[PDB]
Each structure stands twice: as C-alpha cells, then as structure tokens.
Amino acid sequence: AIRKKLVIVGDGACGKTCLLIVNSKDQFPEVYVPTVFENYVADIEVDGKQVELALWDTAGQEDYDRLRPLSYPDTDVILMCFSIDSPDSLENIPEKWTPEVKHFCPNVPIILVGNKKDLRNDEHTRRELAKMKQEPVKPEEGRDMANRIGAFGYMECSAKTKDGVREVFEMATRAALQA
Numbered sequence: 001a002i003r004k005k006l007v008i009v010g011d012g013a014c015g016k017t018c019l020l021i022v023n024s025k026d027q028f029p030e031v032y033v034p035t036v037f038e039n040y041v042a043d044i045e046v047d048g049k050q051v052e053l054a055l056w057d058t059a060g061q062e063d064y065d066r067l068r069p070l071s072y073p074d075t076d077v078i079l080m081c082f083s084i085d086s087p088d089s090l091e092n093i094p095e096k097w098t099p100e101v102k103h104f105c106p107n108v109p110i111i112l113v114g115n116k117k118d119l120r121n122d123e124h125t126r127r128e129l130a131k132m133k134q135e136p137v138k139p140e141e142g143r144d145m146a147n148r149i150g151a152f153g154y155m156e157c158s159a160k161t162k163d164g165v166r167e168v169f170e171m172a173t174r175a176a177l178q179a
C-alpha cells in the first residue's frame with residue numbers, strides 16, 4: 001500500500017479536526033480536542049490503487065505559529081481550510097496560510113477546502129453575518145482564491161452533514177499521487 005502524508009491547516013474553529021474525525025476508527029462524542037492526538041489513517045482507493053494517508057492535524061492560532069512547522073516535514077498533500085461562515089478565515093488564506101505552507105512544503109499540492117457548507121443557507125449564520133454587513137463565502141470566491149494561490153483544486157464540504165467529505169479526501173489522494 002502506497003504511503004502518503006496529509007497535513008490540514010487553517011484558522012482556528014474553521015472545522016479542521018471535525019473534518020478529519022469524519023473518518024475514524026471510533027467516535028468520542030462529548031470530548032473537545034484542539035487537534036487529533038492519535039495516529040489517524042485514511043484508507044482510500046484511487047484508480048485501483050491502495051493508499052494509506054496519514055492525517056496530521058494542526059492548531060491554527062497565532063500562539064502555535066512557532067511550533068506548528070514541526071508537522072510539515074515530508075508532507076505529500078495539504079488541505080488548506082477556511083469556513084464558509086467566516087469571511088475572515090478566507091482572508092487569511094492568501095495572507096497567512098499560503099506563504100507558510102509554500103515555505104515549509106515547497107511544491108506540495110494544496111487542496112483549498114471550504115468547510116461548513118451547511119451554514120451557507122443557515123438562517124442563524126446569515127443573521128449573524130448580516131448584522132455586520134457580511135454574508136457567507138460564495139463558491140465563486142473559493143474558486144477565485146484557488147486560482148490566486150495556485151491550489152490544485154477547490155472543494156466544499158460539511159463535516160456536519162457529510163456532504164463533499166469523501167471527495168475532499170479522494171482529491172487529496174489523487175494530488176498526493178502525482179509526484
């Protein structure tokens with residue numbers, strides 16, 4: 001089985017850990033974990049090929065900036081995340097996440113992921129953004145950002161409803177297999 005390493009990055013609270021947990025051995029409902037702290041591996045079949053994808057979670061807050069790069073050695077694919085309910089999290093994609101990953105992971109493919117897709121049409125989310133004259137991120141903005149940062153692709157998903165989650169990991173695996 002082909003061995004590849006995936007690292008997930010992006011602002012705090014944008015859904016990284018929940019996205020990884022979707023595919024797990026077992027679930028642990030009520031515990032909150034900043035990062036998956038056990039060895040999580042996704043078994044993905046791509047064009048008749050068996051891939052083992054080691055999943056490395058990270059803490060995105062600035063206090064973790066100096067130690068986060070310990071997760072980057074020998075990465076084969078990056079999931080670079082923002083949340084569709086958070087315009088700020090998208091703004092940090094070109095400002096913070098892209099130069100950081102390109103420095104520590106040169107030439108490693110990036111999948112840009114818009115998380116929390118279920119919140120685009122959520123009334124509470126729309127009201128909370130609207131009070132500050134904001135709105136959920138539109139798909140066209142994610143596509144534009146993928147072009148701006150040189151991502152291999154842009155995908156949307158919801159760890160809550162599961163929509164799009166399988167496609168994220170399959171595309172990440174296909175990207176990891178190119179090199």
Ligand SMILES: Nc1nc2c(ncn2[C@@H]2O[C@H](COP(=O)(O)OP(=O)(O)O)[C@@H](O)[C@H]2O)c(=O)[nH]1
Nearest residue numbers: 011012013014015016017018019116158159160
């Ligand atoms: N509605 C919705 N909430 C989500 C989704 N993914 C994560 N969350 C919530 O967002 C919060 C932060 O998620 P987490 O995975 O810990 O984010 P991280 O800080 O990027 O690892 C938690 O309260 C989750 O329950 C999603 O797809 N949809």
Ligand SMILES: [Mg+2]
Nearest residue numbers: 016017034035
């Ligand atoms: Mg987390």
